[PDB]
């Protein structure tokens, strides 16, 4: 089944926090990368996470707000009014047949 992102909650009050849950995560993974926006693009990288070491390394889009968990979920605190709300996960499989999914939340 398709890798999908669920926003918990779907609508988030400005200043509050949103959890991005990941469904249908494939097995035998090497790591995860979360991006701000709709695309895999290193300039929008929030965090790359190596499962084996549990090492999270921030990218240029990391803002202090974002925390990645071992189950691939991304917690975003202190959500801004201007955030269009698109976030993109790339799962990096140990065979490098990698998968992407984009989720969205709606700030009010």
UniProtKB/Swiss-Prot annotation:
Compartment(s) where it occurs, according to its Swiss-Prot or TrEMBL record: Membrane
Post-translational modification summary for this protein: Tyrosine-phosphorylated in response to microbial binding.
Assembly behavior: Interacts with S100A9/calprotectin. This interaction is calcium-dependent, but independent of CEACAM3 phosphorylation.
Glycosylated sites: 71, 78
Domain of life: Eukaryota
Extracellular topology ranges: 2-108
Residues of the full protein shown: 34 to 141 of 252
Name this polypeptide is given: Cell adhesion molecule CEACAM3
Family according to the record: Belongs to the immunoglobulin superfamily. CEA family.
């Amino acid at each position: 089944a398709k890798l999908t992102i669920e926003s918990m909650p779907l609508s988030v009050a400005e200043g509050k926090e949103v959890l991005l849950l990941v469904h249908n995560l494939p097995q035998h993974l090497f790591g995860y990368s979360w991006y701000k926006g709709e695309r895999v693009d290193g300039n929008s990288l929030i965090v790359g996470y190596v499962i084996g070491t549990q090492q999270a390394t921030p990218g240029a889009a990391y803002s202090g707000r974002e925390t990645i968990y071992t189950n691939a979920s991304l917690l975003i605190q202190n959500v801004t009014q201007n955030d269009i709300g698109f976030y993109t996960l790339q799962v990096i499989k140990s065979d490098l047949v990698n998968e992407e999914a984009t989720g969205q939340f709606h700030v009010y």
